[PDB]
Subunit: 276 residues, 3 copies
Amino acid sequence: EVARVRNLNRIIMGKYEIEPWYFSPYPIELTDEDFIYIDDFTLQYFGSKKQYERYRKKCTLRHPPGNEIYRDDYVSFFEIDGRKQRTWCRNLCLLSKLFLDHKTLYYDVDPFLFYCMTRRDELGHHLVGYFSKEKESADGYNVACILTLPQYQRMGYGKLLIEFSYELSKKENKVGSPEKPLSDLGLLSYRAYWSDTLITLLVEHQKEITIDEISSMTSMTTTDILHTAKTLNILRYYKGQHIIFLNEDILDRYNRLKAKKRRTIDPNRLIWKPPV
Amino acid sequence: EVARVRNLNRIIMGKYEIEPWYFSPYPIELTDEDFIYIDDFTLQYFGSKKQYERYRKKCTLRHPPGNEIYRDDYVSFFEIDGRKQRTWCRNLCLLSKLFLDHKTLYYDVDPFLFYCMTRRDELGHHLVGYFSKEKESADGYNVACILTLPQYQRMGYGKLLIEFSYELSKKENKVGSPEKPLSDLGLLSYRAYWSDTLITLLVEHQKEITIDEISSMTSMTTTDILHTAKTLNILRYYKGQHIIFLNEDILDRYNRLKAKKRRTIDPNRLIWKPPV
Amino acid sequence: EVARVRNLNRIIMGKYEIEPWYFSPYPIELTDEDFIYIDDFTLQYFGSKKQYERYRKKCTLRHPPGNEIYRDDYVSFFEIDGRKQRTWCRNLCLLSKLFLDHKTLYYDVDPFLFYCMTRRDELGHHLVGYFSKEKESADGYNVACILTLPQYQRMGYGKLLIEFSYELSKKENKVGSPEKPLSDLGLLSYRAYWSDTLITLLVEHQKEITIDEISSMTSMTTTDILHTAKTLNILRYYKGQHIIFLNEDILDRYNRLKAKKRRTIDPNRLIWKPPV
Ligand SMILES: *C(=O)CSCCNC(=O)CCNC(=O)[C@H](O)C(C)(C)COP(=O)(O)OP(=O)(O)OC[C@H]1O[C@@H](n2cnc3c(N)ncnc32)[C@H](O)[C@@H]1OP(=O)(O)O
Ligand SMILES: *C(=O)CSCCNC(=O)CCNC(=O)[C@H](O)C(C)(C)COP(=O)(O)OP(=O)(O)OC[C@H]1O[C@@H](n2cnc3c(N)ncnc32)[C@H](O)[C@@H]1OP(=O)(O)O
Ligand SMILES: *C(=O)CSCCNC(=O)CCNC(=O)[C@H](O)C(C)(C)COP(=O)(O)OP(=O)(O)OC[C@H]1O[C@@H](n2cnc3c(N)ncnc32)[C@H](O)[C@@H]1OP(=O)(O)O
């Protein structure tokens, strides 16, 4: 007799069978099986397909449990107060930890707001990703953690999440930046976003733009703007202050960007007021 | 010809075949096999079943190599000076690292005492878990690391380990708390222990108890007591100082606790004097 | 229909099929397969054997892209400026992260020099390992990261890498030490190197040696020398200063060392000048 004591090697979420990148503290018994079921609406975990099915039949809403503060023909965003949806948010944090090297104690969700993005199609809502945000951040971080579910990665969803986080900051009349340190995956996504943003501004708004003007338009911090401008070699001094400027390289990058036919966030569709 | 260079994907310990959660620096060659044998008495590791068997036949004690400072009809605890049992303790630390995200250099065991708990039955002693403790802690930490072997997890052993660590502190006439930061699994276990402890005191000892009284009786720190009391909503001011108090919720939690018929540590059976 | 979304569970490098120890941010799509190909010359990654083959046929150099600053009948070392070989060095850093718990953002290679060691035989050059080094280190660290590829580990290559790093420091007229914190594997390798070095000096150079003399001869720091001397019990006071001294234990260790017939670095074959 050999008694197997297995690690969690796969989660079953709808039709997807996903392998974790890191360990996550699901409060489950270790057994001779190496899978659990994750319900794609409730995020509840189950050791058995039968227990999962039983709960699946129950009458539940088919989208994240919060206020829909943005809705276009491609995506919705739901704003959730961790304190008001403890169970669901804990479940979200356990799922997220499978794909992060480190993360704060999953159980304590009260200090956070969660902004969860769904794609909608003929079958309704499907959660594709989220970012959390501290209700009160000493450092003015506008994102605490950010995740695109692995089955949906590299489809442009992460960039939509980041863009949305800056629309919140703009509505708040504040600059902001993601919490440090960032994973390599996160930092490379932010650098691409920051780069695409400056490039788009230079072609669509004005050929020369000051640091203050960029900050006002984007809610990016001075530090992130300067780092990005130096990487693109577009930092100059004109009319007594620092600017970024348009050149052939930037025009070329812009046209390649547009060629990709990506979706973006429409600021006009954000129906939201800061807490005051 | 394909030469496979495998990671350690399973350890064989008695009848158990256990999958690691994290990497551990066993000083072994990488080969086309992905298992090692861990002897459940010596904790020695072997690349081959045959080498393991050879050493298994040798005449060895059948419990951890230290002084038995506690023995009841359910468990024993052995106190081991890392400096006096370097090999065995190094082996214990390698095994433990398989289930921890981080851990101090496994090789340097001299600064630690190890308290190892066995379950005893008709077959003798079986190591189920341990906690280490710094001989000298600047922060007064009463536990450095704590582990229940995975094949024995979720059976109540972790709570026994924690309870024992506080009996040491009480005998020492000191308050103490586990080393921070704690893993999520560790912190949730401590919170349950702290919660069960306050609840039991309120039903069994006195309906209202001051912070000083709790600390004296439990060796819990002021900080851990207050955090726990606020979570349970039982913090008040009475007769000129802060207390915790009994209510219907607490009574209900107590009866559910007792219903579970758990084993506890008997302070009378701890035969031990602090180093002086 | 079950859609599998797999983690990277094996890399194929020449004839070797290697299992990663940790996650690494290869910018690849997650699919129903769990392998990638790593070209053993370019370090480029490929999702398909066919794409790999296509690029393999192209005319490339068959050794690392830098200056060969050391060449004996066993190994070569190539010095590479990260800024001058960004692609190759990024690829090296992704490969290395598979075997490290943590590592700086793989993409930013400009601040580093890479010293890459090959073994040469009838088939030419084979990369077996490397160490990186900050062009400018505030702490005077003489190694930033160090790695022997897993298929080549425990063959003595790591010790050659370390020995080479100290020959650079000696040529620079500086003491140095590896960046902290070190992995357990790294620290145990350094301790063995430091120990073998002091033992060899005592038998081959002088029976009693001062701290200054050791530092001058080895580029080891005072701290690493004292730690190593205390571990070996060879620290004394003689003629008004601290020394290490030879004894029977040391002689015995030396003869066992020589018995192993290891290769070493020949300082005479390092053809190199510091940047000035
Ligand atoms: C916390 O502080 C922040 S740091 C922690 C970040 N989270 C984290 O590490 C969790 C795991 N990672 C992720 O969740 C995920 O990697 C993100 C969230 C970091 C990024 O999410 P996405 O994958 O969704 O990002 P995208 O917007 O898709 O961009 C990624 C790359 O994929 C390419 N892409 C995009 N759309 C594409 C289509 N249609 N076809 C092909 N390729 C596409 C993008 O170009 C982009 O960058 P690359 O140049 O590498 O592709
Ligand atoms: C260092 O600083 C400390 S932080 C590092 C902690 N270590 C660590 O992370 C290593 C890996 N983890 C462990 O070793 C392990 O998870 C512990 C030691 C943290 C906890 O050990 P146990 O698993 O043994 O703890 P228990 O006392 O069993 O309690 C755990 C949960 O299981 C439930 N339980 C208990 N007995 C049960 C029976 N008979 N039947 C069913 N369930 C039982 C308990 O209720 C308890 O909490 P849950 O509410 O999640 O169950
Ligand atoms: C950064 O700051 C530094 S800390 C990060 C270090 N890197 C890291 O962790 C990455 C992963 N690890 C490695 O790459 C690797 O483990 C090293 C680089 C740390 C060590 O490399 P090697 O494996 O090549 O080291 P060696 O010189 O081989 O010595 C290792 C042990 O193997 C034994 N050995 C050596 N030659 C042998 C032959 N011919 N036969 C049998 N055994 C041999 C050595 O004795 C040595 O120590 P042990 O006593 O454990 O063997």
